[model samples]
Every structure is written in C-alpha cells, then in structure tokens.
Target: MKFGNKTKYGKIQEWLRSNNEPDYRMKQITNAIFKQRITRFEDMTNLPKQLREDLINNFGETVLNIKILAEQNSEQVTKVLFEVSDGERVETVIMKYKAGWESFCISSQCLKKNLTVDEITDQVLYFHLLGHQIDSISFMGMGEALANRQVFDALDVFTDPNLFALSPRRLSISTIGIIPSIKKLTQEYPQVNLTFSLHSPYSEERSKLMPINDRYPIDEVMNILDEYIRKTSRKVYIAYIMLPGVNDSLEHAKEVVSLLKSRYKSGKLYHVNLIRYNPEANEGQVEAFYKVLKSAGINVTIRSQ
Candidate 1:
C-alpha cells in the first residue's frame, strides 16, 4: 500500500478489478499518489469519477490512512503523534541536527503482527509530504529490536532501491547482546550501523543490569562481534552509559580498554561513546572516565544530551 494499511490497497484493487478496469490503472493510481503527490482522491483526474468516490468512501478523502493527531514543538525537535489505522497511536520525533540536517525517529508501539511495508515507511514519506528532506532516520526507542522479527522486514524496506534507497551508513539500529538477532544482522545488514548497548563489560555486572545477559553471556556476544568485524570490516559503536561510581570507576575504564583491545590486532575496530544520563553524573568524574579511555589509545567521545 503506497499510503497506509494493507487492507487499504486491497480495497482499491477490488474496486478496479470489479469494474473491469485496464491493467495500467494500478500504475496510474500509484503515479498520481506517489509521483504527483496527490493526496485527495478527488484531485486524481486520470481516475474515473466513479472510482474516485469509491476510494473516498473506502479509504478516506486523503490517500493516507494514517492521520496526524497532534504535534508539539520544543527547542529544535518536533514530536508528532500519528494515529495509524486500527486506531493505534504511534509517536515519532523529528529533530534538527546542529548542522541543519533534519532526522526522524519513529518507534512503532504495537507489533502484535509484523509490520508491513507501508506501515514501516509511512512516517518517512509523511515527512516527505511535509516538505522536509529528511537527512537520516533511526528505528530507535526500539526496546530489544532484535527480539522482533519484523525489524528485519523494516530493514529490508529501508534499503530497497525502489523504496527508501537510503544509504546503509545513514541508517542505524540500536540493540543489546541478543545473540540470535546479533548473528542475524551481522550476516544480513552488516553495513547498517550496529550500536551495541554494552552497559557493562563484566558479565556479572551486565547480568544484573540487563537480565538477558544471564541467557546470552558476554563471551557469547563477543564471539559473534568478532566474526562480525572480521566479515564486515566495519566499525561497531560501543554505547556506554556512565553512572556515578557504578561503571565510571578507573577499573571499569581499564576493563573496557582490555575487552575492546583484542578485536583487530589493535586495529581500532571499536568506537566508544561515553553517553551521559543527565538525570545523574558528575562533571569531573565524567572527564576522568573520558581521559582514561583517551589515554588507553581508545577512540572515544563524551556524548551529552
């Protein structure tokens, strides 16, 4: 479906077929909506008047089944609450980069069924309808994205040439050490950015923070990561969220250096982002952790929000 729900397209197809329409009618409808950016069914002149009324009655006045419920603007970000078909509300964020680039972050709330092509892409194309040439996008706010098989479908749609055609480098998927999903992405979408939420390098500590670690241990995740780099030869981002006296200790910093050290024969395969949880942290403590990684010959940066 070029616009919304999977059922929406079927309804249009039914109408066209029942009326004994020409085979080229589908292409015409797609072009009117996708190429010409015609949202109103009434504005579609090439379509017969009977089909126009049928579309409006079956779908809606506009091509999209998803409707904007509300928008809130604050600082450089605008949050949109979109009501998708079946009356589900999915919220997404459109943020402005410091360099003037605009990025969209959409998180699907319901995944009882795997998302379809249009379900995943409507957010980006909605922005396309808004006149903002989105520079980048992420499937963030994604809680354990690897756990959802639908994410792979979402990724496929994102990279398709006739669809999004987005550079794999421009897209990123954030996830933790879910071995099944990790191994899957490693082989499938290796070029897409993989940001591992390495909250703690130590197994016991990590298991306490993220209980899933009990099932898939650090060693297990590490072996897959090693294979990933050897195959893809791409950089993997290590997401370390600093805590006061928790993971910010000098010993913790040293452990990170050792763990990330062996990967590429000291070939610098990892980049660590010292993310701050502003709800808590010490400025001096943050810098101390930063310098520790810096001096260890680690590629690192302090990421502040």
Candidate 2:
C-alpha cells in the first residue's frame, strides 16, 4: 500500500521540471524516498547543494507527508499522531503478534484479536526490542483485564518458568471489579498483585461510576477481595480516583475509613491509592482525606499522575 503525500511527490516532479532539472533528478529523488526510505532532504548528499537547498526552501526539510505530533504505546502496539498539509491530525498504529509477526493498525484503521501465548509474548518482546528489561508487567491498560478469560491464559504463560519466567509477585492485574476473575486469580494466581478500581466506597455511587458494580456490586466484590486476601495472604490495592467534589470530601474519607473497618479481616489488607482525580486537584481536600485515613490507621498513598 502506498502511504505518502501524493501532492508532495507531485510537487517534487513539478519542481524538477520548473528548475530545468534533468529527468534523472526526478527519478533519483523518487527512488530515494521509496527505495532508500530516506525522509530528510538534507541527507541527500548525491544531489547538488543548490538543488537540495531549493527543495528545502520550497517544501519542508523532510519529504514525509505527515508532521509527527505525538506517539503512544500499548501492550503490543505503537501509535503515531501526525498532522497533514491542512494541519489536520491523522493517527497511525502498528501492532505486533507472536512469532515476530506484525501488522499495521491505526486511524488511517483495525481489530480485536484473541490473546494467545505467542501474542502476549509479542507485547513483552516489543519492549525487549527497545532495549528495555521488561522488569515489571501490568495488565491494566486498554480495557478491563479481568473481564477476559483469555487474560487468565495469559497469566499462566507469563508465570511459566520456561516462558516469561516472571514470578507472580512481579505481575499485576487491574479490573473494574470482576468478581469471577477476582476469585479465579485468587485461586490460580494468588501471588499476583490485584488492583481493584474502587473509585467510590458508596455502592450506588460506584455503580454509577463503573457499571460493573451493577453486575457485581461493590459489597460483593469486596467480599471476593476479602476472600482473596484471606486465601492467599496477598495485598490488594483499592485504586481510588479523588474527584473534586464527588468523592474527595472529609465525609467521603470517613466513609472510606468506615468501609475498611467494616470489611478488612487483617491477614493481608488493602491499600487505598488516591490517583489524583485530574491534572489539577483539590490538595487541601485530598490532604485532609489522607489525614483522615492515616489517623484511622488505614494504609493509603497519593498516587502520582
């Protein structure tokens, strides 16, 4: 598939003809882009200095269609945000699979695929390709991880000594609170860290925040969590986002303390993390809320953004 600024290439053709340049110059420039995969005009040493300078003056330094704005990462994918001639943004994504197979994905388009052993490993191998150690693995981004049974299969692969060889302690999973997955992870991979999205201590309110609470209410999920701690003696984190006025009040903090006191059985307890609601937040309120939790002897920390 041809992915380029056709208009930009057309301009190069015109620029050559207008400057009384030879046909070979057009062929060389075109071949340089597609064959050499060269993007920068400055890197074309074989071309005359005057000619190259003219191209840069008329067009941009790079013959690339899109101006890169930003890029992002996911489990096994990388995405790029680019702006075109009219200054409109276009998104492009590239994804990799198991056995070193990779494919294109993005706004310029794609799929939902199954998580097989090799595919999951592809994600890890990606970072390894970048010279990263792949020290810690987290199953929290993209979507609600526990909702997928395939995730359990992935967990099995990750923990296999012959494969990733990662200890369960080094891995973590986040969920909006899927009790079945919670119970299954506790039974099968209890050593793995569990991060529960306990956005609010209030049942109805939490139900509104995360609809999973409607299926598996906060009370029931906590029971499952309590059982997880009891069965494995492993700690779980209650991921709480401190909303400005909704769940960051002194009363809200008191409710949090009350919830812990009512439920915690103490073998391995839970920690509340204030994932500071937004970019800017109510510090006085969060600090006071934190003070309340610490005063009540509850383990909590303000999470960094």
Q: lDDT scores for all predictions? A: 0.74, 0.67
Q: Summarize candidate 2's per-residue lDDT along 232-295 as a digit string, tens digits.
A: 8878898888777778878788888888888866412888888875453587788888889889
Instruction: Report residue 101 deviation for candidate 1 (angstroms).
Output: 1.0
Give per-model CA RMSD: 3.6, 15.0
**Colliding pairs, model 1:** none
TM-scores for all candidates: the values are 0.83, 0.63
Off by over 4 Å in 1: 1-35, 40-42, 51-63, 85-87, 110-118, 264-267
> Model 1, residue 16: displacement in angstroms?
6.9
Compared with the true structure, what per-residue lDDT tens digits does model 1 show for residues 1-305? 33222334445765677778876776677667556766688998998898789778877787666678898774688888777767777777878876778887866445343344455567766776667775787777535656667667666656655345677777887777888888899998988888888878898999999898899887778778778888999888888988777888887887888887865656278789998876544777878888888898999988886
